Amino acid sequence: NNPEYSSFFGVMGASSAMVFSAMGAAYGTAKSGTGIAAMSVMRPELIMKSIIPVVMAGIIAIYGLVVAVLIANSLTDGITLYRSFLQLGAGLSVGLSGLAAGFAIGIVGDAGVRGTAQQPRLFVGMILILIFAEVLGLYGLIVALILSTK
Amino acid sequence: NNPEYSSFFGVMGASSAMVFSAMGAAYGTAKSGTGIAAMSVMRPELIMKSIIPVVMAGIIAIYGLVVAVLIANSLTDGITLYRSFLQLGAGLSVGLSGLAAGFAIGIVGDAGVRGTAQQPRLFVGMILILIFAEVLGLYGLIVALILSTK
Amino acid sequence: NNPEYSSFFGVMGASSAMVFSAMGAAYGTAKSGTGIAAMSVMRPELIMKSIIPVVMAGIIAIYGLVVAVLIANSLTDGITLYRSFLQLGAGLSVGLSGLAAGFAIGIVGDAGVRGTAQQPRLFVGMILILIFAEVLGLYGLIVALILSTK
Amino acid sequence: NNPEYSSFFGVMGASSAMVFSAMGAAYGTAKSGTGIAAMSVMRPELIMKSIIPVVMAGIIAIYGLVVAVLIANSLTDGITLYRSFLQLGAGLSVGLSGLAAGFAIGIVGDAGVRGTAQQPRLFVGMILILIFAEVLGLYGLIVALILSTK
Amino acid sequence: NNPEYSSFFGVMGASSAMVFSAMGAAYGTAKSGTGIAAMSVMRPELIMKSIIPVVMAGIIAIYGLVVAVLIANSLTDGITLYRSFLQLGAGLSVGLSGLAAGFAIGIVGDAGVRGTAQQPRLFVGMILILIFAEVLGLYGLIVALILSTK
Amino acid sequence: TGLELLYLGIFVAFWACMIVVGICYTIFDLGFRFDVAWFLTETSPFMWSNLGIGLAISLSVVGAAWGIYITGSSIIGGGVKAPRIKTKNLVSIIFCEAVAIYGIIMAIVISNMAEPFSATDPKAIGHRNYHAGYSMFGAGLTVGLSNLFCGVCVGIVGSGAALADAQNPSLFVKILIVEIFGSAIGLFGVIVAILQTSRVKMG
Amino acid sequence: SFFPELYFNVDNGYLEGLVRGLKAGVLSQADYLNLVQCETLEDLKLHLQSTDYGNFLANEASPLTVSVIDDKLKEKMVVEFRHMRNHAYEPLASFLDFITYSYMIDNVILLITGTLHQRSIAELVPKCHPLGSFEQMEAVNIAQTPAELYNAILVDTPLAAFFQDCISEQDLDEMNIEIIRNTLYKAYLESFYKFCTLLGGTTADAMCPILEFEADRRAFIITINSFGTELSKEDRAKLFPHCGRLYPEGLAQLARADDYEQVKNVADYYPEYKLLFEGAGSNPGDKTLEDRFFEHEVKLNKLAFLNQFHFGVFYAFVKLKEQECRNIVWIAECIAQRHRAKIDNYIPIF
Amino acid sequence: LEYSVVFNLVLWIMTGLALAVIITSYNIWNMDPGYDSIIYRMT
Numbered sequence A, B, C, D, E: 001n002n003p004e005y006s007s008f009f010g011v012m013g014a015s016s017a018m019v020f021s022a023m024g025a026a027y028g029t030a031k032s033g034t035g036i037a038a039m040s041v042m043r044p045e046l047i048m049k050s051i052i053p054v055v056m057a058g059i060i061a062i063y064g065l066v067v068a069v070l071i072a073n074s075l076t077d078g079i080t081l082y083r084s085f086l087q088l089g090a091g092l093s094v095g096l097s098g099l100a101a102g103f104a105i106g107i108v109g110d111a112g113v114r115g116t117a118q119q120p121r122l123f124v125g126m127i128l129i130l131i132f133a134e135v136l137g138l139y140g141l142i143v144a145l146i147l148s149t150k
Numbered sequence F: 001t002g003l004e005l006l007y008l009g010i011f012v013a014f015w016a017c018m019i020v021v022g023i024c025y026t027i028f029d030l031g032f033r034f035d036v037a038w039f040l041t042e043t044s045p046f047m048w049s050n051l052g053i054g055l056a057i058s059l060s061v062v063g064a065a066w067g068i069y070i071t072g073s074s075i076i077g078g079g080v081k082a083p084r085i086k087t088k089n090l091v092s093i094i095f096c097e098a099v100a101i102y103g104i105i106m107a108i109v110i111s112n113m114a115e116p117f118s119a120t121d122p123k124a125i126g127h128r129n130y131h132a133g134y135s136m137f138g139a140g141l142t143v144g145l146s147n148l149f150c151g152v153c154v155g156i157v158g159s160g161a162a163l164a165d166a167q168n169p170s171l172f173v174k175i176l177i178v179e180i181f182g183s184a185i186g187l188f189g190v191i192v193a194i195l196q197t198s199r200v201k202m203g
Numbered sequence G: 001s002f003f004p005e006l007y008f009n010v011d012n013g014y015l016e017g018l019v020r021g022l023k024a025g026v027l028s029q030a031d032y033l034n035l036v037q038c039e040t041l042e043d044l045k046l047h048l049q050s051t052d053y054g055n056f057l058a059n060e061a062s063p064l065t066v067s068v069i070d071d072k073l074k075e076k077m078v079v080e081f082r083h084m085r086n087h088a089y090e091p092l093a094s095f096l097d098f099i100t101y102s103y104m105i106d107n108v109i110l111l112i113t114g115t116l117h118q119r120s121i122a123e124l125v126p127k128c129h130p131l132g133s134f135e136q137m138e139a140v141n142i143a144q145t146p147a148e149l150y151n152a153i154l155v156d157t158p159l160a161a162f163f164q165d166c167i168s169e170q171d172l173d174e175m176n177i178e179i180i181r182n183t184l185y186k187a188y189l190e191s192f193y194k195f196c197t198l199l200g201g202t203t204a205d206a207m208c209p210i211l212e213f214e215a216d217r218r219a220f221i222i223t224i225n226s227f228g229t230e231l232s233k234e235d236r237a238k239l240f241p242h243c244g245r246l247y248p249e250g251l252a253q254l255a256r257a258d259d260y261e262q263v264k265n266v267a268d269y270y271p272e273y274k275l276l277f278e279g280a281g282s283n284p285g286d287k288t289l290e291d292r293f294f295e296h297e298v299k300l301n302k303l304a305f306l307n308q309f310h311f312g313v314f315y316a317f318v319k320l321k322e323q324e325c326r327n328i329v330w331i332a333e334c335i336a337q338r339h340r341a342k343i344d345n346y347i348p349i350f
Numbered sequence H: 001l002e003y004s005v006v007f008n009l010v011l012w013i014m015t016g017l018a019l020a021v022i023i024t025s026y027n028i029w030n031m032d033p034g035y036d037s038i039i040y041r042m043t
């Protein structure tokens, strides 16, 4: 059958994979930037190190972009409805997992950057937490890379 | 052949690409303007140097405009429902990615310009963070263009 | 022949181009007038120079008006549904881009007039930000024209 | 050969033109009202001079009334769906443009009458800003007429 | 013959004319009364004069009633859909214009009554503003009549 | 504002859904499925009439209770130091209760217009029955909401008058006028309701 | 508008009526004249018994003293406020708590002053204002340790939020007690203004003007009193509350101010303060600036009663009764010291 | 032929379930942190 609207869900999947990942990364970057601004006044030498959270947030966006492009490359005029649903699911997975990971990274980075201004030893700990948070996004990506290619 | 309502999603894609990107850039500009107004009272000679976040928000708006014009030049009466969905997805992707990037740019720029009033070394850091937010919108544009040219 | 509901979307495009642009200009003018009233108590001589925000807000309304009139001149009994979609998209684009630009102009102008009461050197900077907060509306107008004259 | 429900939209034009404008005007006449009262305790001699905002708000209402009456005189039993949509668009345009202009006039007039009690020179400035706000409503009327007299 | 459901919109027109005008008049009377009662302890000799706003608010109700009566007298079980829509529009116009005028009268009357308690010279000014608000309701009535008689 | 947030979310979601649904129906040439005639016609007139009566009574009682508590809190707060209030200001309460009375009366005046059909086909139900149902619903709405607003307004004015009375005895007699004005609205609603169901006849 | 009419009386209508009834008992001008015509404090009590005060002073010893009258007036006000608070719900309860923070800020200053000078904290409670009583036991039996007292304030006192303006307990021994008090009051006033603005509606409308005048008068008098002291302009500007109508460029100009003439010039931009400064001749025999500010404060509190559905009535009543108690104490002082000439310096209310 | 019934059943059941989940998650997310005895010690 291949209904004429079959590609709608795949396109929405690409749009989600990019939009929600971008939202998560934007929140992460905003919170980390606020923390870095509030930290650098007293501890200027820590500006470059304490930029690690932003990078992590950026990585989340990358994830989304990948999936989005992948979904964008898997589209086609006669895309079967099953594949369109698969791609919508992959897009929602990656996008919302990236949104959650970006929120977590933003909060963790703000807190850890502010704390490291007062307790240098916290730095490594923050990194660990950040990694865990970022892994969440990776999980979404993995699921997306299982769905968009299923 | 093609349904008479196909062009609806294309026009909505163009309108979203413009409107949401403009909303993001407007938020970025507003937050950066408030930050600069607060900063300039004590440290006036930083006003010109501190106009960067507004420029980055403008660049996000330009991303949105580019995608909107691309969709508005590839929009024809006999636009296939599939291509109409492609253009709607491109528009939503660029518009909401630019919205998120504008939010991040506004918050980061406000914090960075306020801090640089007190810590000059923060300036460079702010720029870095802003770039990490800017790429978000860029990512959206990338995806949008793909979907627009698919 | 053509659907009778196409004129509804055409008139919605016209009325949106007018209404949303007027709302943006009204918000800009209200915020700028509040800022001017607050500023002029101590610095009367800047009552006139601080009116530039309002003008830059009024321009946004003009943009909308332009598009609105264009649509109100392109309307006819037998506009193809695709033409009605084009007009609706142009109207939404101009109206909502002008709304965002008006929000940005109001916030930036209020902050700039309040700051300029304490720091004259901010004025020029303020102007630049307003321009960056005004081109957004211009962008919308452009897209609207590209959609309206297609 | 036209739907018997075609006039509905046209009516909802007239109604809207007189309703929303009125609401806008009311807000103006409300906010300015309060302002005058608040500033009348200390500076009684400015009560009559500081009645300009209300007058401007009143004019906004008239705009709506005009369009409403115009629409109410253009209605017919066999009104085509196209003309009905035109009248609905004109009514919404004038009503919501007047609503935005009334909000702006109320805020600006309250601020200006409160400030002029403290800064006489602000009076002229206020007037200018009010004119700009008034112009917004005027724009709507223009568009409404263009839509309501096709 | 005409539709079975045609009288619904006329019925709703009468109901709106009365309900929303009653809402406006009730709010105006409540606000004015709670201002007048609180003033009276300080300035007991003003109550009678300060009753003027209440009367104005009451007039709004009358307008609704008038139009309601019209719609309740010209409404038969077999009125054309066109006349039913006209009565619905007249009812909505009068009701919502009266609502806005009642809100404006309540706000202005309360503020002006308190100011007169503090500044007798404001009395006349208040009256003017009240008239400017009261006229709004009148405008609605006009339009309502034009729609209900047509 | 958690509950306010929930209400705002429900409202925004419902109306965004309505906008998108209307756009889809209009654009996909499926407008014929959006039969408002079918909704207004298949829906039984009994629903409209009974909702009208129920609202006529319930909204009037809601306004009466709103005003009664609004003014009774003030009466019983002021009377702690000036108990005379309890004697004089009951008039305010009376006015509020008067609202409710109108309610029941109109309910009766509406409930007397009901009658079964023994028909289900809209052609069989007919213009007379459909208009009877719609007009009973509209009269119920008018009386109920006018009485609600009148009761709330009279309660607010009565609370103000009771607070004023606690400090100067010679003010209530001059503030009651406002209440009288606030009461008129109630009557107006009743009148309109009586005009809406004047020529209503189910059967 | 916020429509406080519809739901205010649900929780606070009874207390609105009760506080207005209490305000009806504040001495009028005629009662003030009657008390002014007294010859002896016993005659003052006699003439005061006919007012709302009644027999509040009959129990006390026949040889009355101004201290006894002041204590009884303060006790009556405290009892009335506590009764109102006990019957108040969450929002109005928070409002009344904010009212009491004003006296808690002075009480905590007393506590730290005593602790630093090594006097038992339990022996300082009698001198604390009742409305700001530290019923919490965490700040008692401190063993005269300033660090323990600071931790107690942070843990078991609503002032913990305002003590974040400071940076550490060392500040207790670093900054002068007056600077600490003024910083705490600035933070408290800003928090109160934010709370009132969040409440919105008639509460914000009728309460923001009072807090704005409080901030402006705080700025003016901190500028005027600090001219001859070591309090630097940079440290002085930190004590100006940001709620006032002077915030844009007004507080800055005051901070740059270096003389009373410059303060008058700054006030000139605001007619409402221009009149107060003009009337404050400040030479012997006429109203001083503080008296003019007291008159304006009383005027604002009185105008707070023209609104109905708002919490500002409680703050207005508390301040008006505070001024009434001060007026009665002033009249008693003039009677006792036989200085009839200045007996008219009391600020009338209603 | 029963499209109306199943559509309404599913729509309203799932809307109610989603509202319940949202309300519960808001009541837990916006739960009082519980360490108010520690907020003033850490800050």
Ligand SMILES: CCCCCCCCCCCCCCCCCC(=O)OC[C@H](COP(=O)([O-])OCC[N+](C)(C)C)OC(=O)CCCCCCCCCCCCCCCCC
Pocket: F009, F010, F012, F013, F014, F016, F017, F020, F021, F022, F024, F025, F028, F030, F033, H003, H015, H019
């Ligand atoms: C969040 C708070 C809790 C929820 C409270 C609010 C609840 C709102 C109630 C929803 C009921 C809406 C009516 C459903 C029936 C109409 C559907 C329709 O127009 O399509 C069918 C109509 C008519 O369909 P048809 O008539 O061709 O189908 C044949 C007939 N049936 C199916 C019955 C056999 O048009 C279509 O066919 C459109 C197909 C695409 C579907 C588009 C649906 C519109 C909405 C989609 C996005 C969701 C909107 C919200 C956005 C996110 C939130 C803000």
Ligand SMILES: CCCCCCCCCCCCCCCCCC(=O)OC[C@H](COP(=O)([O-])OCC[N+](C)(C)C)OC(=O)CCCCCCCCCCCCCCCCC
Pocket: A005, A008, B003, B009, B012, B016, B092, F020, F024, F028, F029, F030
């Ligand atoms: C930013 C928000 C994201 C955008 C998407 C929002 C959610 C909307 C999706 C809801 C789920 C519905 C998916 C389609 C389900 C299948 C429907 C079907 O069979 O279609 C038959 C319908 C109706 O039948 P028909 O027209 O195909 O059959 C012919 C009928 N005659 C002969 C009468 C013409 O048509 C389609 O084929 C529709 C296919 C595409 C539908 C896409 C969803 C519609 C809503 C899109 C969003 C609208 C706003 C756009 C702008 C937003 C910008 C912010």
Ligand SMILES: CCCCCCCCCCCCCCCCCC(=O)OC[C@H](COP(=O)([O-])OCC[N+](C)(C)C)OC(=O)CCCCCCCCCCCCCCCCC
Pocket: C003, C004, C005, C006, C008, C009, C012, C013, C015, C016, C088, D003, D081, F015, F018, F019, F021, F022, F023, F025, F026, F027, F029, F030, F031, F032, F034
């Ligand atoms: C939020 C506040 C309320 C306003 C927004 C929501 C309004 C509507 C909400 C109720 C549910 C949807 C109602 C419409 C149902 C569709 C009726 C239908 O198909 O018949 C159409 C009818 C008839 O359709 P038809 O297919 O019979 O065509 C006529 C064909 N002949 C003559 C041969 C019979 O015509 C119209 O198009 C009337 C216009 C109304 C339909 C469109 C609804 C607009 C929804 C809001 C979005 C507006 C777009 C622009 C956005 C910017 C706005 C400034």
Ligand SMILES: CCCCCCCCCCCCCCCCCCCC(=O)O[C@H](COC(=O)CCCCCCCCCCCCCC)COP(=O)(O)OCCN
Pocket: A009, A012, A013, A015, A016, A019, A092, B092, B096
């Ligand atoms: C900010 C956003 C920016 C990014 C862009 C937007 C991306 C997110 C939005 C995605 C929208 C697409 C959702 C797809 C819903 C429809 C799926 C097809 C349904 C379908 O055909 O089957 C019907 C079942 O309906 C059903 O019951 C299906 C309804 C499913 C309801 C659940 C809601 C969707 C879940 C995903 C949304 C998540 C959003 C998160 C923010 C059968 O019905 P029939 O028998 O009549 O079929 C007759 C057809 N021939």
Ligand SMILES: CCCCCCCCCCCCCCCCCCCC(=O)O[C@H](COC(=O)CCCCCCCCCCCCCC)COP(=O)(O)OCCN
Pocket: F001, F002, F003, F004, F005, F006, F007, F009, F010, F011, F013, H019, H022, H023, H026, H027, H030
């Ligand atoms: C905004 C983002 C987009 C949202 C879109 C989805 C739709 C909206 C869903 C809610 C989204 C926002 C989160 C709100 C959660 C619920 C409200 C707050 C929490 C809550 O319910 O708890 C208390 C009520 O108790 C309760 O638990 C009682 C509530 C349950 C009652 C159910 C009955 C209503 C059914 C709906 C029909 C009525 C329609 C009326 C328009 C209110 O907390 P508080 O404010 O006292 O404390 C302050 C903090 N909670």
Ligand SMILES: CCCCCCCCCCCCCCCCCCCC(=O)O[C@H](COC(=O)CCCCCCCCCCCCCC)COP(=O)(O)OCCN
Pocket: D005, D008, D009, D012, E012, E016, F031, F032, F033, F034, F035, F036, F037, F038
């Ligand atoms: C910018 C914002 C949007 C503004 C635009 C207006 C939006 C209004 C929302 C309502 C929906 C739009 C109105 C037009 C569509 C009406 C439905 C047309 C579909 C149709 O063909 O149905 C006819 C019956 O409907 C009819 O003839 C029904 C006539 C009445 C339609 C209007 C009623 C809407 C509800 C108003 C409530 C007001 C409440 C006030 C308190 C067929 O019938 P047939 O005779 O061919 O049957 C043949 C059976 N064999």
Ligand SMILES: CCCCCCCCCCCCCCCCCCCC(=O)O[C@H](COC(=O)CCCCCCCCCCCCCC)COP(=O)(O)OCCN
Pocket: A092, A096, H002, H003, H006, H007, H010, H011, H014, H015, H018
């Ligand atoms: C974070 C990402 C994850 C997303 C969150 C979770 C969302 C997942 C989706 C959950 C919501 C919907 C779940 C399924 C709904 C459909 C259930 C019935 C299945 C169905 O299609 O039944 C047909 C009949 O349906 C019918 O006749 C009527 C079907 C129409 C149902 C429409 C339901 C409206 C949408 C409900 C959810 C809205 C809000 C959800 C939050 C087949 O039966 P047949 O015998 O006809 O077989 C075909 C031969 N004719």
Ligand SMILES: CC(C)CCC[C@@H](C)[C@H]1CC[C@H]2[C@@H]3CC=C4C[C@@H](O)CC[C@]4(C)[C@H]3CC[C@]12C
Pocket: A062, A065, A066, A067, A069, A070, A073
């Ligand atoms: C890390 C930065 C530079 C972001 C870009 C990530 C790169 C590695 C990703 C993003 C999207 C990816 C593409 C997604 C889809 C496909 C389809 C397949 O048929 C060939 C590989 C190809 C073309 C991928 C190549 C690698 C790719 C370009």
Ligand SMILES: CC(C)CCC[C@@H](C)[C@H]1CC[C@H]2[C@@H]3CC=C4C[C@@H](O)CC[C@]4(C)[C@H]3CC[C@]12C
Pocket: A138, A142, A145, A146, A149
């Ligand atoms: C590289 C670091 C971050 C570790 C992450 C693990 C990566 C390498 C793993 C985890 C899940 C994997 C994907 C799982 C499923 C599929 C679909 C299959 O048809 C081909 C490969 C593909 C697309 C895999 C590619 C590699 C992958 C993404």
Ligand SMILES: CC(C)CCC[C@@H](C)[C@H]1CC[C@H]2[C@@H]3CC=C4C[C@@H](O)CC[C@]4(C)[C@H]3CC[C@]12C
Pocket: B062, B065, B066, B069, B070, B073
């Ligand atoms: C500063 C702002 C205005 C930047 C504007 C964005 C520019 C770079 C973009 C927006 C849309 C683009 C145009 C889109 C379509 C066409 C037609 C095509 O056949 C060749 C290039 C051309 C002509 C593009 C040139 C570059 C372009 C004008």
Ligand SMILES: CC(C)CCC[C@@H](C)[C@H]1CC[C@H]2[C@@H]3CC=C4C[C@@H](O)CC[C@]4(C)[C@H]3CC[C@]12C
Pocket: B141, B142, B143, B145, B146, B147, B149, B150
């Ligand atoms: C400012 C820049 C970096 C943003 C855009 C990224 C560039 C590199 C990307 C975005 C979309 C891409 C296009 C998407 C699709 C096609 C169609 C294909 O048949 C040839 C390549 C071509 C034409 C791509 C060329 C590269 C492209 C233009």
Ligand SMILES: CC(C)CCC[C@@H](C)[C@H]1CC[C@H]2[C@@H]3CC=C4C[C@@H](O)CC[C@]4(C)[C@H]3CC[C@]12C
Pocket: C062, C065, C066, C067, C069, C070, C073
């Ligand atoms: C306030 C003023 C100075 C700003 C500009 C507004 C005026 C001049 C604008 C607004 C609407 C515009 C019109 C929009 C549409 C049309 C139809 C088009 O086919 C030719 C020009 C014409 C007729 C335009 C002429 C200029 C116009 C009238």
Ligand SMILES: CC(C)CCC[C@@H](C)[C@H]1CC[C@H]2[C@@H]3CC=C4C[C@@H](O)CC[C@]4(C)[C@H]3CC[C@]12C
Pocket: C138, C141, C142, C145, C146, C149, C150
């Ligand atoms: C130059 C900068 C400042 C932009 C200001 C002018 C903008 C708003 C307007 C003025 C005239 C307009 C052009 C007029 C006509 C056409 C031809 C049409 O088929 C597509 C759009 C296009 C190409 C328009 C694009 C937008 C446009 C260039």
Ligand SMILES: CC(C)CCC[C@@H](C)[C@H]1CC[C@H]2[C@@H]3CC=C4C[C@@H](O)CC[C@]4(C)[C@H]3CC[C@]12C
Pocket: D062, D065, D066, D067, D069, D070, D073
């Ligand atoms: C002073 C009184 C009349 C009310 C104030 C508003 C007046 C000026 C408005 C209200 C309605 C208006 C009328 C509305 C419609 C038309 C039809 C048009 O083809 C000629 C102008 C004419 C006849 C307008 C003239 C001006 C008008 C009478």
Ligand SMILES: CC(C)CCC[C@@H](C)[C@H]1CC[C@H]2[C@@H]3CC=C4C[C@@H](O)CC[C@]4(C)[C@H]3CC[C@]12C
Pocket: D138, D141, D142, D143, D145, D146, D147, D149, D150
């Ligand atoms: C500054 C002045 C001119 C503006 C104030 C009056 C406005 C409302 C009037 C003056 C002249 C009017 C125009 C004169 C003639 C027509 C032709 C008609 O087919 C559509 C409306 C249109 C295009 C009018 C629009 C409204 C209009 C611009």
Ligand SMILES: CC(C)CCC[C@@H](C)[C@H]1CC[C@H]2[C@@H]3CC=C4C[C@@H](O)CC[C@]4(C)[C@H]3CC[C@]12C
Pocket: E138, E141, E142, E143, E145, E146, E147, E149, E150
């Ligand atoms: C009566 C007092 C309050 C003065 C206010 C004027 C209002 C209420 C009345 C008095 C005369 C009325 C007009 C008399 C005649 C007609 C002609 C009819 O086809 C439409 C209504 C219309 C145009 C009326 C509109 C409303 C009107 C202007």
